[PDB]
Each structure stands twice: as structure tokens, then as C-alpha cells.
Amino acid sequence: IPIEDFITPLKFLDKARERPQVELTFEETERRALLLKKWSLYKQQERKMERDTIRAMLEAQQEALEELQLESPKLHAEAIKRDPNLFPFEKEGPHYTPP
Amino acid sequence: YKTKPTHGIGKYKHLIKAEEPKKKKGKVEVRAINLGTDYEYGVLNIHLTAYDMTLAESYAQYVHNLCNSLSIKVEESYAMPTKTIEVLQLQDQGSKMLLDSVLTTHERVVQISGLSATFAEIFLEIIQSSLPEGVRLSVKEHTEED
Amino acid sequence: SPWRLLGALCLQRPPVVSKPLTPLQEEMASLLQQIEIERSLYSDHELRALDENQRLAKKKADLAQDLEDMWEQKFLQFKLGARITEADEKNDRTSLNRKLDRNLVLLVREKFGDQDVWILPQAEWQPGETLRGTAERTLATLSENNMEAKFLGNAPCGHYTFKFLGAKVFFFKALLLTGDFSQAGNKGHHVWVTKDELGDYLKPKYLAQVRRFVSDL
Amino acid sequence: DSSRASLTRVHRQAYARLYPVLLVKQDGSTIHIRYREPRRMLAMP
Amino acid sequence: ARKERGWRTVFPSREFWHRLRVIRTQHHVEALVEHQNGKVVVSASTREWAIKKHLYSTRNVVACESIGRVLAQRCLEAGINFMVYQPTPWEAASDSMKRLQSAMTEGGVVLREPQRIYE
Amino acid sequence: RRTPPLGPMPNSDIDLSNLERLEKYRSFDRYRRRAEQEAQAPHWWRTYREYFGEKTDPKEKIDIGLPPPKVSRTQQLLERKQAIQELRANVEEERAARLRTASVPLDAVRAEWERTCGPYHKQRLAEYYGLYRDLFHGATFVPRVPLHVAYAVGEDDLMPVYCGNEVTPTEAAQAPEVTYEAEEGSLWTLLL
RNA sequence: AGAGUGUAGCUUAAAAGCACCCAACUUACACUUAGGAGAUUCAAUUGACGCUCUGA
């Protein structure tokens, strides 16, 4: 039975008069729009680098698989199939300070 | 008409396979199709948990757009309820009083269906390289009831 | 048909710290925290400032500051662990803790009779045994310690051609859990090396084309 | 590559304030955590 | 003249003497005026160097507003001032098409073609 | 009793196997673009375009006019790149574009439209009205030189004849003011 | 050293159409809206710049 926790609590209704004030200027909005434009171009650059690395790595692996298929008729049958060593695979994330 | 050369020109349901079956309580899992020369894994789970909520949501959005871009199918994406953990603080001088502070924990899940083994290893390493700050990844199996 | 049976492997190492942040991303995190402040509403600390000082002026007409100064003191007593374990060494290329922002690949030295090669560690597979099994077998030989290199797949990585009697080079990769390195003063010149230093250390075409399938970060 | 998913906005509509506390784990390792009540160091035993 | 009445289940309806038709590429915005037999009469597109040099960001809203003004001028010089605009709902709620229809009406060109006589 | 088709069936080129690894139409306008693209093709069954009076249009039509004047498109493309790069240098243009307030000099784009692509537009307007159908029995041309004829009624205004305008015969009472560019070696025949 | 060559990622496109990226809506995807960056390697159809395969 699923338990949902995207419900905002019922205390979140009443005290709704703390920050409705948004009073900005023109220089801040043009700064924010220019920064969003810069960040859009930057993220397109990162995605392009990521795609080129994925495609080059894939053609490298396929070149290796083709040469193994040419040079050895038995090792591809064991080489393609995935061994059960990586069934409960996991990896914990990076840190900020060393031990 | 049935005898004309243009018979069956308006055929459409041989293009749409979706039978609209009961896709809420069905548990007909796809299995690992393994031919040795053709290994193909099934309906493996991906878990992303963190104490921060917005980091888990952002990385789930990242991995969803990533596997969508690489044409490997998303089965379902959903979230577990949160857990909350107390750091019951022992007092420094007189350690018999236990004060308390609050902390939280969220979790997000995506599912992938089509995995050849080469794309499996390249997929897991490319998620693992772009793994963000603070979360932990765990590629688990399918029988995970809530 | 004589094919001289030769594999290889490349050691994979996870980074420990995130890479430092770019200045446009600093401005983006600043404005993201700004938009966060604008759309936020009714924290407990916000009332514990505002209506606490309001009721303070109220009963003066008849907390927050102390605890936040305490939190400044709790920051200042704990100096965090310094990320720079890199410039204080500046020399130890053989150490696991030299570089932590990036990923690193290990490479061993043995000058042969005919050949003279700085090698990313090889494997010599036997026709009774499998390829990845010989990869972890030579990994047990070449390292002379206890390490847990979790492999990533049964599929090989990169194939190259040297013939003198034909031969071939079959690559593998494996992610490291923890390196418990015994005999750190080894004279078999293994070296923990990043991508830029990988491109530095390689002379040949056999090692130049390796960099296309290591993670460039 | 760990700069791709670190730039985030709290995407729920109604939400409180959060502060970048520096959380130290069981080996002395820092994580930026968006946590309220602007503490500066959180020691998880 | 008789309009092509009918078709009654498909979209767009073929009941017009002239239609307004706008094509929104990811690079350019182009507006056409067609007769119902299929031959176009006037068009204003940002692929043309004349509209290209005088504005910035040919995709955006003010480019479509300029396309509306230039097309309204070009079709008043063509003697055609009744046409039908038949959009999808999400295009009709878009700000770009709103300001393009505003530029067409403020240019003097009126939509909603009159009735046929003895229809 | 069946009969085989006289050509390819329309949805036959896609493969019915591996359906879940195909790309679907995620929208309505994508299908709309594909369907109105497909409705222009010469199909072999019976269609709407065959019956409803399209005059049997496929046949090449004779050009009788001036040739196009030769331009070097490489230099023109690089100079236009230079011009839009010079306009993209200004920052108040970016403020006007973001702030939804940036108009166009309609007279300048009018004269430039008369200069560059206007002859082809006037050609298709002249073919829509049936001028080439009734003046030269189908033989077409392009109005290479621009022309300006304006009518005279009152004191200040004008009533010009552009391509396809409407002018009342009271405004056409006297001879109009005809002007165009010409060199001092050319003779012309006007005809109304 | 030889050979094939040549428009941004693709195109029996000729400066285009799809692809692609950011913001808003959605748990998320997807739709939609509002923005972003993009190319003919040069020299007079011929010649010397980059890549790919074969070499050593």
C-alpha cells in the first residue's frame, strides 16, 4: 500500500503573508536574463561534450567487439553475456572534505 | 471496398499495439533474455536517495532525460515516502540528558528495460561519472514492493 | 593460425571531491539562492526573529540571536578538512591520495629485450580460461596487494594491432572500491595518473588511442 | 561532470527557507545540505 | 461565390475564400495568405533579407508582430482585406499569435470573412 | 476475389515488428505537418485534387522577359553576416527584444522588398488574378523593373495602383503620374 | 608513403528543414508557451587545408 509524501501539510495554509513582496528594477531583470542566456549556452556546451564522449566510447567498444569476433569464434559468446557479479550494483557519491 | 485495389487503405490498428491493459496492478515482468551471444537484461531498478529533496529530484530529472535521449525505455518513475531521522544529542558535560535535532531522507526511482551488456556498463559508468554531490546510487532488482 | 594471446586492463578510480565550481555557475547559484529567498515563506527561524523581536518590543513597552551566534562559533571551532592534499605533496605520483578531484588510471613499467614500452598493465590469456577471468587473474598478479576492483562488464574495451606471428591487445576496465596498497615503495613503476598526465606519459599510438574511452571528465 | 546536477531550485510551490549547512559524516566528509534554522556544522554520530 | 462547405469532421474547415496560415519553424516565422484552390497570393517571411536586417531574433514574438504588420501592408496593397484565421487552441492562446492578429487588425485587415449571399 | 494494388501501400514502409522502439508522434502538429505534406504527393488512387478543377497544371510555361541580373552569392552572404553581426553588437536591441518593444521601419522594408524579392511576389499575384492567362494565353514573365503609377484626384494625397488595388473611376478621371527608373539609352512602350 | 574525400549532428536542402539546449507547467516524462546558439577550410568547374582507411 503506497504511502504518499508529496502532500504539503495543512499548516502551510494560514501564515501566508510573510513574503508576497517582489519589488525589482530593470538592471536586475536584464542581469538575470543575460545570466540565463549564458547558462543556456553553457549547458548546451556540456551536453554536446557528453554526447561526443558517449558516441566515441561506443564506437571504440564496437571496434573492439568486431575485432574480437573476427579473431576468435568462441570468446564473443562469453564476452557478450553479462555475468551476475553486478546484480546488486551501487556506488556512493563524492564528498567535499577528505578524511 | 474489398475487391478494389485500394482495399485496406484505412487500416490503423495494426500500427497501435497498446491494448490498454490493467497497467496498475499487473505484475507481468519482462525477464532477462540471455542467449550468450545476445544478452539483454529486463526491468532492473534504479534508486537515488538523499537527505536533500531537490538534489534527488534534479538528478532523477537528469537520468530520465538521459535514458530518454538514448532511446532505452522508461517503464515508470515514482517516489517512496520520506524518512525522518533524529540526531539525539547527548549533552557534553552531563551526558545523561539527550537533546534532539531533526533531519530527513527522500528517495526517487526510475526503471529501464532495454540493456545490452556493453550499453549496461557504459550506461552505469556514465551515470556514475556525472553523479552529483551527496546522493547514493543503487541499481537494484524488480521485486520491490512499497 | 598463430595469434599471440595477449589481453590488457585499465584501472578505474572514483574521485573523492567534486571539482571546483566555475564563476558563471557561482553567479547562477547566487541568483538561484535569490529566487529561493523570494519564493520561500514561513520558516520557523523567520518567526523566531520577527515576532520574537515584536513581542520583545511589546513586553518592553510594558532565542534567535544567541543561537545563531552559537552556530557561528560552532562553525569557527571546527576547521574543515582541507581539500588540498595535492600541492602539499606535489611529488608523490605513486600515491592513491595524490589527486581526488578527477579520475585516475594506473600504468606499470617494464623495459623488454626488443621493445621498450611504458605499459598500461597487460594480460596473457590461456586457452582454457576466459578473458575477464584472466584480467582479474593478472590483476591479482601485477598488484601484489589486496584491492577490490569491481568489474563493469564482460565486454572488452579497445582492440589494437601489433604483429611481428600475429597478436592483438584486449582491454578491460574495473572500478576500485578501496585501495589497500601494500609495499607502496614498489620499483615496478606503477603510477596513479589523471587524463592530462595520461596524455603526457604516452609515447605511442598504442596508448594514444586509449584516451578516447577513458572518462575525460 | 558532477556540476551537472548540483544547480537546483526547490521546485515545490509552497516551501519554507533552507540554509546551506555543512554536514560532516562518519569520516569527516562535508555535504552541502539545504536545511532550515541556519546551523553551520551538523555532526552525525 | 460559393465557399467549399462541408468536411464537417476533419480540420481545418474548408469554408473560406481566403485563409491566414502561419508556419512557425525553429528558425523563421512565415505567414501566408492562400486561396482555397491552393495558390498563395501574398506572404511575409523572415527568410527575406528585407525583414531580416531590420530585426533581431527572427523566432521571437516581435518578429511575428513585424510579420503581421508587413503582411497586412502587403495585402492591403493587394486589395485583399478579408481572410480567415483558423488555429489550434494552444496557438490561439499563445502571445505571438495574439499580437500577430492585433497587428493584422490594427493594420486594417479584418478577419471573419462575410457571409455568402443566398448561401 | 481480390485485386492487388497498383503501387505501394501508404503505411507499408514502416516495420510492424519492433513497434516500441519506434518514435511516436508526440504531438498533434507533427502529424498535421506530415499529413499536409503527404496530401500534396501524386497518389495513384482517386483524390480530391483530381476532380475539383486544378486545370491540369503540370506543363512548363514559357518565360518572356529580362534575365536575372548576376549576383555573387558568397560575397552577399558574407556581407549580410557582417550586417547582422553589427546589429547583434548593440545591446539596446537585446533590451528591446527581451522587453517586447521593437518595431520595424515599414517604408524601408517596403523599398527593400521592391528591391530584392518583390518581382516574384508580383508575378504570383499577376498569375493569381489570371493576367498571364488572358494577356499572353498562359505565357508568363517577371516584372523586372519596379514601377510607380499614382492617380490624381484632389490636392495632397494619392491613390496609387499597386498590384491588385481598388481605385474608383472618379479617381481615374485623368491620366496618372507614371514613374520608374530608366537609363538614357532605352525606349519604352506603355500600355493600359 | 598511397587512396578516398569535404554544408553546424543528419539530409539524391540550396545559406533550409529536422535534430539540440535553458526557463515556466507537470513526481517526472511528454504536449504547449517563452528564449538560446549554430555552419560551405582556403586559392583561380582547377590548385594547397582537415578527416578517414591502408602503410612502415
- Any chain B CB within 8 A of the CB of A64? no
Q: Which residue is nearest to nucleotide G19 (CA to C1')?
A: E26
Rounded CA gap, F25 and F21, in Å?
Answer: 13
Question: Side chain identity at C17, as an amino acid letter?
Answer: V
- Which residue carries 508576497 as its cell? A20
Rounded CA gap, B131 and A92, in Å?
Answer: 9
Rounded CA gap, E18 and E9, in Å?
Answer: 20
Q: Are C75 and D40 spatial neighbours (Cβ–Cβ below 8 Å)?
A: yes
The residue among E56, E73, E62, E69 whose CA lies nearest residue E101 is: E69
Beta strand F148-151 pairing with F177-179: antiparallel
- Structural domain range at position D17: 1-45
Buried b (16+ CB within 10 A) or exposed e, E79-92: ebbebbbeeeeeee
The residue among B123, A99, D11, A72 whose CA lies nearest residue C36 is: D11
Instruction: Say if residue B72 is exposed, middle or buried (CB neighbours under 10 Å; 0-12, 13-18, 19+).
Output: middle
DSSP class of residue F24 equals P
Contacts of F54 in chain E (CB under 8 A): 37-38
C-alpha cell belonging to residue A79: 564476452
Rounded CA gap, D26 and F124, in Å?
Answer: 79
Q: Are C36 and D20 spatial neighbours (Cβ–Cβ below 8 Å)?
A: no
How many other CB atoms are there within 10 angstroms of residue F191's CB atom? 4
Give the residue on A whose Cα is nearest the Cα of B136. A92
Rounded CA gap, F126 and F66, in Å?
Answer: 17
C-beta pairs of E57-62 under 8 Å, 24+ apart in sequence: E57/F97, E58/E27, E58/E28, E58/E29, E59/E26, E59/E27, E59/E28, E59/E29, E60/F97, E61/E95, E61/E96, E61/E99, E61/F100, E62/F96, E62/F97, E62/F100, E62/F101, E62/F102, E62/F103
Rounded CA gap, C110 and C92, in Å?
Answer: 20
CATH topology assigned to domain C92-216: Nucleoside Triphosphate Pyrophosphohydrolase (3.90.79)
φ/ψ of residue A73, rounded to 5: -75, -10
Which residues in chain E, range 62-81, keep a C-beta under 7 Å from any nucleic strand G atom? 62
Count the helix, strand and coil residues of chain F and give each as a percent rounded to the nearest 5: 35, 5, 60
Domain range list for chain E: 1-119
How many other CB atoms are there within 10 angstroms of residue F133's CB atom? 14
Rounded CA gap, C12 and C151, in Å?
Answer: 9
Say whether B14 and F16 touch across the interface (CB within 8 A). yes
Domains contained in chain A, number? 1
Residue–nucleotide distance: D19 CA to G15 C1' (Å): 51
User: Which residue(s) pair with A92 in the sheet?
Assistant: B136
Cis peptide before E12 (omega within 30 of 0): yes
- Any chain A CB within 8 A of the CB of C126? no
The residue among A39, A78, D19, F144 whose CA lies nearest residue C131 is: A78
Cα radius of gyration rounded to whole Å, chain F: 26
User: Which residue(s) pair with B101 in the sheet?
Assistant: B87
CATH classification at residue D21: 6.20.130.20
What DSSP string runs through B101-134? Answer: EEEEEEEEEEEE--B-HHHHHHHHHHHHHT--SS
Q: Where are the beta strands (DSSP E) in chain F?
A: 148-151, 159-161, 177-179
Which residues in chain C, range 173-212, keep a C-beta under 7 Å from any nucleic strand G atom? 205
Rounded CA gap, A27 and F91, in Å?
Answer: 13
Task: Indicate which technique resolved this structure.
Answer: cryo-EM
Residue–nucleotide distance: C55 CA to G13 C1' (Å): 73
User: Which residue(s) pair with C161 in the sheet?
Assistant: none
> With the CA atoms of C106, C112, C115 and C118 taken in that order, what torsion angle do they form, in degrees rounded to the nearest 10?
20
Which runs of consecutive H residues, i.e. helices, occur in chain A? 26-71, 75-80
Q: Is the CB of B65 under 7 A from strand G?
A: yes
Q: Are B56 and B50 spatial neighbours (Cβ–Cβ below 8 Å)?
A: yes
C-alpha cell belonging to residue E31: 505567414
Say whether A98 and D31 touch across the interface (CB within 8 A). no
Say whether C17 and A96 touch across the interface (CB within 8 A). yes
Rounded CA gap, C155 and C97, in Å?
Answer: 30
- Which residue carries 495543512 as its cell? A10
CATH topology assigned to domain E1-119: Nucleotidyltransferase; domain 5 (3.30.420)
Buried b (16+ CB within 10 A) or exposed e, E99-109: bbbebbeebeb
CATH classification at residue A87: 6.10.250.3440
Sign of the C-alpha dihedral, residues A6, B138, D23, C98?
A: negative
What DSSP string runs through chain C? Answer: --EE--EE-EEE---SBPPPPPHHHHHHHHHHHHHHHHH----HHHHHHHHHHHHHHHHH----HHHHHHHHHHHHHSPPPPS-SSTTTSS-TT-TTS--SS--EEEEEEE-SS-EEEES-EE---TTS-HHHHHHHHHHHHH-SEEEEEE--SS---EE-----EE-EE--EEEEEEEE-S-TT-SS--EEE-HHHHHHH--SHHHHGGGGSS---
Contacts of A90 in chain C (CB under 8 A): none
Domains contained in chain D, number? 1
What DSSP string runs through chain E? Answer: -------TTSSS----SEEEEEEE-SS-EEEEEEETTS-EEEEEETTSHHHHHT-S-TTSHHHHHHHHHHHHHHHHTTT--EEEE---HHHHTSHHHHHHHHHHHHTT-EES-PPPTT-
CA distance F127 to chain E (A): 9
Query: What contacts D35, CB < 8 A, 6 or more positions away?
Result: B103, D18, D19, D21, D23, D42
Rounded CA gap, B44 and B112, in Å?
Answer: 6
Q: Are C15 and C142 spatial neighbours (Cβ–Cβ below 8 Å)?
A: no
